[PDB]
Amino acid sequence: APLTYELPDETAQLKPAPQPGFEAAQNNCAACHSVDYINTQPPGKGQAFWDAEVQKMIKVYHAPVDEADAKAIADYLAKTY
Amino acid sequence: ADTVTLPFANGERPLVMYPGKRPLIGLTARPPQLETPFSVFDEGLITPNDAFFVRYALAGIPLEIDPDAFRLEIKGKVGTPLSLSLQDLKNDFPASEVVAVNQCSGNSRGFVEPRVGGGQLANGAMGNARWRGVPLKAVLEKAGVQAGAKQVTFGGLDGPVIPETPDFVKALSIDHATDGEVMLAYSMNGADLPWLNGYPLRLVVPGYYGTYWVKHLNEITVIDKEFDGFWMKTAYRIPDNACACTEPGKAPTATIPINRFDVRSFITNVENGASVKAGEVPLRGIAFDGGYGITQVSVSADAGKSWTNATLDPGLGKYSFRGWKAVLPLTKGDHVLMCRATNARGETQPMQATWNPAGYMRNVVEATRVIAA
Ligand code: HEC
Numbered sequence: 001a002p003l004t005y006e007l008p009d010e011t012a013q014l015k016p017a018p019q020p021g022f023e024a025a026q027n028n029c030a031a032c033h034s035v036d037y038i039n040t041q042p043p044g045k046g047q048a049f050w051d052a053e054v055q056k057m058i059k060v061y062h063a064p065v066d067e068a069d070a071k072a073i074a075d076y077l078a079k080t081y
Numbered sequence: 082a083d084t085v086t087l088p089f090a091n092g093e094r095p096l097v098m099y100p101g102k103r104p105l106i107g108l109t110a111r112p113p114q115l116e117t118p119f120s121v122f123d124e125g126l127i128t129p130n131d132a133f134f135v136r137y138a139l140a141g142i143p144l145e146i147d148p149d150a151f152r153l154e155i156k157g158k159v160g161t162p163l164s165l166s167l168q169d170l171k172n173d174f175p176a177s178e179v180v181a182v183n184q185c186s187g188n189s190r191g192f193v194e195p196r197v198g199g200g201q202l203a204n205g206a207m208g209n210a211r212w213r214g215v216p217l218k219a220v221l222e223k224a225g226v227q228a229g230a231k232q233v234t235f236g237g238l239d240g241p242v243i244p245e246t247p248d249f250v251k252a253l254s255i256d257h258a259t260d261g262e263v264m265l266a267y268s269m270n271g272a273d274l275p276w277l278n279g280y281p282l283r284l285v286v287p288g289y290y291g292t293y294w295v296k297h298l299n300e301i302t303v304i305d306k307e308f309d310g311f312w313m314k315t316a317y318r319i320p321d322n323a324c325a326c327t328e329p330g331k332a333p334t335a336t337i338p339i340n341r342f343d344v345r346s347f348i349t350n351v352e353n354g355a356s357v358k359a360g361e362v363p364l365r366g367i368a369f370d371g372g373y374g375i376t377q378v379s380v381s382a383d384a385g386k387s388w389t390n391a392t393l394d395p396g397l398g399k400y401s402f403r404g405w406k407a408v409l410p411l412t413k414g415d416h417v418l419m420c421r422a423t424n425a426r427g428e429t430q431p432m433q434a435t436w437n438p439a440g441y442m443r444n445v446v447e448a449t450r451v452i453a454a
């Protein structure tokens with residue numbers, strides 16, 4: 001038999017917010033990696049930081065996120081984190 | 082259940098337990114990324130396998146491996162392509178060992194000011210281990226490197242979840258790869274590699290930042306050009322200058338791939354706000370650099386106004402953590418303790434922190450406030 005490795009359960013969640021970007025982030029930002037990547041970023045970085053993070057996911061890593069969702073996610077993040 | 086708080090903003094993390102590991106600081110779950118609690122570095126000179134830090138770029142890490150079917154492929158600009166089993170490696174080549182620090186490019190990124198994006202690590206993304214395996218030099222000589230060869234690329238079993246994302250592939254220069262120290266390590270601290278530390282085989286690149294130490298290593302390609310893969314050409318770049326640094330907020334005009342460690346040192350037996358007994362206070366800790374050797378470690382109890390020479394421990398090799406010990410007279414009250422190391426080519430730590438956009442290569446003189454009573 002091969003050797004196998006058992007990873008513990010993934011429990012990281014996005015902070016809920018009333019903004020539409022919350023749902024959109026749930027649907028787009030967990031596909032390649034856990035969302036603790038987002039939760040652990042430096043706090044209160046603001047609009048420009050999160051705009052750049054979102055764009056990098058799309059342009060460099062080829063995240064399938066459209067323009068309207070990208071803006072919604074970035075605004076949700078800049079307002080919440 | 083358990084959490085810790087790292088000493089920078091948004092520093093809360095879960096303590097998480099992975100198979101074969103003690104509880105560690107969980108940075109990310111997918112892919113797994115684990116930082117070592119600072120207290121571990123005061124436990125001894127060699128970092129235990131169950132405490133060793135974990136960093137990965139992509140979520141598609143292997144979770145099932147048959148060590149018997151595993152092959153390392155050697156190809157490209159070589160006379161004879163090779164397909165080597167682990168048993169091949171252990172039997173057909175001579176073994177070497179090296180005690181060497183592995184430290185992430187981004188170790189201590191959480192301390193960078195202004196804060197930058199990326200893995201928000203404290204100082205626990207480093208570790209020192211006894212590595213055993215085959216010098217890459219010997220495998221490459223057997224394949225027969227062609228004149229014309231410029232670089233060697235290294236790839237592992239892990240992969241991107243989405244095929245369009247660039248697969249994790251690194252490159253060394255040919256003369257570096259054939260230097261005799263660059264190693265194909267199948268053993269860490271006398272055991273097989275822990276899974277998350279690259280079971281069954283990894284590249285060990287002594288004195289170089291961790292990004293080069295490719296885990297689950299299965300593909301070696303000798304090429305006669307510069308490799309322009311994303312993880313060399315775009316990621317892991319530093320400012321092309323002596324401080325590897327820019328003015329806070331500024332992008333560099335020129336960059337180069339991250340390469341060799343700068344000089345670091347830490348005080349391990351005390352942490353911020355520790356109580357010590359006024360009088361002779363015994364301090365100890367560690368220092369390391371990129372393989373030139375630690376020449377001395379100085380200690381300060383007046384926030385860098387005056388310095389005392391530490392006594393260096395017997396060493397385990399130029400790539401290892403170098404231990405040190407000092408006894409400092411401390412009057413009652415507050416003291417800001419510092420340590421500063423210099424190496425055999427005269428590199429030392431700056432008193433003031435530098436900055437780059439990636440938050441790479443931090444090595445500022447560490448300060449630790451203690452209370453003497
Ligand atoms: C696969 C196509 C991705 C999707 C979908 C999203 N991101 Fe991502 N992200 C991706 C990679 C390959 C990495 C590197 C991980 C590593 O360990 O090096 C990341 C990392 C992040 C981070 C950390 C900081 C950084 O490296 O920039 C953040 C904050 C982040 N990702 C955010 C993020 C968001 C907001 C997404 C929805 C738009 C998202 N990611 C999707 C690849 C992928």
Ligand code: MSS
Pocket residue numbers: 133134135136137138139183184185186187236237238239249277278279290291292293294295296297298
């Ligand atoms: N294969 C692979 N390998 C690899 C990876 C990935 O992702 N993949 N990562 C890197 C990094 S990035 Mo930064 O620079 S650090 C680091 C290292 C770590 O190791 P450990 O985990 O064993 O500790 O690894 C190395 N290797």
